[PDB]
């Protein structure tokens, strides 16, 4: 059954696999179906924007991805609290709220607070019959378009810094080396041991 | 070219809707053209054929300037019988040979209260076709 130089293989076809096959012949028939689920939803709503509410700036987990910015679920209470808007009024403004999200940084806290005040100043509401509390005249001269596309304020916008040019100085071309990695890598793993020998000389008398 | 995606273009399903046709569809599909004198007086092209229309045959073995009335309209065999075109059998009894109404020209309609209302509706729906040319 084997032969000359080839691969040793484990095809997982020892199970009755012709019954559970999924063939995608309706896949153009469904791509033209859920376009119609968007178009006949977008005109169904309002001049309210398509593709739903506004999402936060959110940094990804897991060291491979922690250098980038993603759109999240909801802004949350801490960020809604500073911006001034109520936690249950926020989702009829068009702002999604995720109450189980935590803020433990302050840089990313103020990023979404700056994001959320920037949204409200480029939002125009419609009073029912024109009393207009916290709203003014004719609606931004008929609001300059009708309906937006795939994100309100371009939710990824992964941006980087300039940091143009420096001159290589002393204490910079001298010190911060490979050896500072290897010593800091050792000092993290000899940390608990060396604090145990320190107890031993304290009980030495 | 057909654009409506709810009506057939296959051979086998259009025949099956033809030979299994209901008898009220079957009077519609057994229609015959009016004569050139008479389609100018009524400005309508063709009419579903009935029992006492004066009529002449325009193609076939029996043809040519033989106005003579229909006498019996088989819908089941898609056939009118006309009182003059016949055939002697081997027995000597004479029988009506049957011909299809597409091969046949009405030369005098039989007007009743309904054949006014059919012509007027088939003629009124042509001036709106003229009114589209603006």
């Amino acid at each position: 059954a084997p032969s000359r130089n080839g691969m040793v293989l484990k095809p997982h076809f020892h199970k009755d696999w012709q019954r559970r096959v999924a063939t995608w012949f309706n896949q153009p028939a469904r791509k033209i179906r859920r376009r119609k689920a968007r178009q006949a939803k977008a005109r169904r709503i309002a001049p309210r924007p398509a593709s739903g509410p506004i999402r936060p700036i959110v940094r990804c987990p897991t060291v491979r991805y922690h250098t980038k910015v993603r759109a999240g679920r909801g802004f949350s209470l801490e960020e809604l609290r500073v911006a001034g808007i109520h936690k249950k009024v926020a989702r009829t403004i068009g702002i999604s709220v995720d109450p189980r999200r935590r803020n433990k940084s302050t840089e990313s806290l103020q990023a979404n607070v700056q994001r959320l005040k920037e949204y409200r100043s480029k939002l125009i509401l419609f009073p029912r019959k024109p009393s207009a509390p916290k709203k003014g005249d004719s609606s931004a001269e008929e609001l300059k378009l009708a309906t937006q596309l795939t994100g309100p304020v371009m939710p990824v916008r992964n941006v980087y810094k300039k940091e143009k040019a420096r001159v290589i100085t002393e204490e910079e071309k001298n010190f911060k080396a490979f050896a500072s990695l290897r010593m800091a890598r050792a000092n993290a793993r000899l940390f608990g041991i060396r604090a145990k020998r320190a107890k031993e000389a304290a009980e030495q008398d | 070219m057909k654009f409506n995606p709810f009506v057939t273009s296959d051979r086998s399903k259009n025949r099956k809707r033809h030979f299994n046709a209901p008898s009220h569809i079957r009077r519609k599909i057994m229609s015959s053209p009016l004569s050139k004198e008479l389609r100018q007086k009524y400005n309508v092209r063709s009419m579903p054929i009935r029992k006492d229309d004066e009529v002449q045959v325009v193609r076939g073995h029996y043809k040519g300037q033989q106005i003579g009335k229909v006498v019996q309209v088989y819908r089941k065999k898609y056939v009118i019988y006309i009182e003059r075109v016949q055939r002697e059998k081997a027995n000597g009894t004479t029988v009506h040979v049957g011909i299809h109404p597409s091969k046949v020209v009405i030369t005098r309609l039989k007007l009743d209260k309904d054949r006014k209302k059919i012509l007027e509706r088939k003629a009124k729906s042509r001036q709106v076709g003229k009114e589209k040319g603006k």
Binding site: - | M1, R11, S12
Partner: protein, 260 residues
């Protein structure tokens, strides 16, 4: 072949009884009662390896080859030899990339379409399409395609303004948009060189849609047009050049046949 021809209860007769060892159907009474059951031999059996609907029907071509073939499909529709040797009678027509002005895009009625092609001397190709109004040879007639036909000219445009309605009653004709061209329309049968009537605004847009060799395409993000493997391609001029024939030996033009 839907499930199979395996909706039959049947066993081999096995032992002697002077019959083949193929499975026989059960029961008695009926004719179908001692007959050869499933197996690709039997009246009523199951076909060999019944065709499966998960066959790879569909093929990928990577898109620089799709755009490679669509630059080679347009460049041969400008050479009069290749477009006439595909059969399009383009004798009387003027200049081969035909460009009528952009007013043609607002034709709304097919009388205007017909005398257009007559005055561009391209009706004599549409009239050839009426000559191939045969019916199909073979069993494809009962699978509802009965008439074969030549494909004629293709009119390629931008900003449809009613032009699609005026030309589509004319047989054998094709209308494709200059933003979204098609290898299946421009090169029917796989052979290159279909006769085409461009419009001005379609014809100028080709420069910004495939790009020249100095500047890339603007409406296509990262595409520039493919370079040549031969620059001078008429080698009857190269081999008669004084640089070549200064260097050659001489022709050796005896025959030196077999000697008795």
């Amino acid at each position: 072949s839907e499930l199979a021809g395996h909706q039959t209860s049947a066993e081999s007769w096995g032992t002697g009884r002077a019959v083949a060892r193929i499975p026989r159907v059960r029961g008695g009474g009926t004719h179908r009662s001692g007959q050869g059951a499933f197996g690709n031999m039997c009246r009523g059996g199951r076909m060999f390896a019944p065709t499966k609907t998960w066959r790879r029907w569909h093929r990928r071509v990577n898109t620089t080859q799709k755009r490679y073939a669509i630059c080679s499909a347009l460049a041969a529709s400008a050479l009069p030899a290749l477009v006439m040797s595909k059969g399009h009678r383009i004798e009387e027509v003027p200049e081969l990339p035909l460009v009528v002005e952009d007013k043609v895009e607002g034709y709304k009625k097919t009388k205007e379409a017909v005398l257009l092609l007559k005055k561009l001397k391209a009706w004599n190709d549409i009239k050839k399409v009426y000559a191939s109004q045969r019916m199909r040879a073979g069993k494809g007639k009962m699978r509802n395609r009965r008439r074969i036909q030549r494909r004629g000219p293709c009119i390629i445009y931008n900003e449809d303004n009613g032009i699609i309605k005026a030309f589509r009653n004319i047989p054998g004709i094709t209308l494709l948009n200059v933003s979204k061209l098609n290898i299946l329309k421009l090169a029917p049968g796989g052979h290159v060189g279909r006769f085409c009537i461009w419009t001005e605004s379609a014809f100028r847009k080709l420069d910004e849609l495939y790009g020249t060799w100095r500047k890339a395409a603007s409406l296509k993000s990262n595409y520039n047009l493919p370079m040549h493997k031969m620059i001078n391609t008429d080698l009857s001029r190269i081999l008669k050049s004084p640089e070549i024939q200064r260097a050659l030996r001489a022709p050796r033009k005896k025959i030196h046949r077999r000697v008795l």
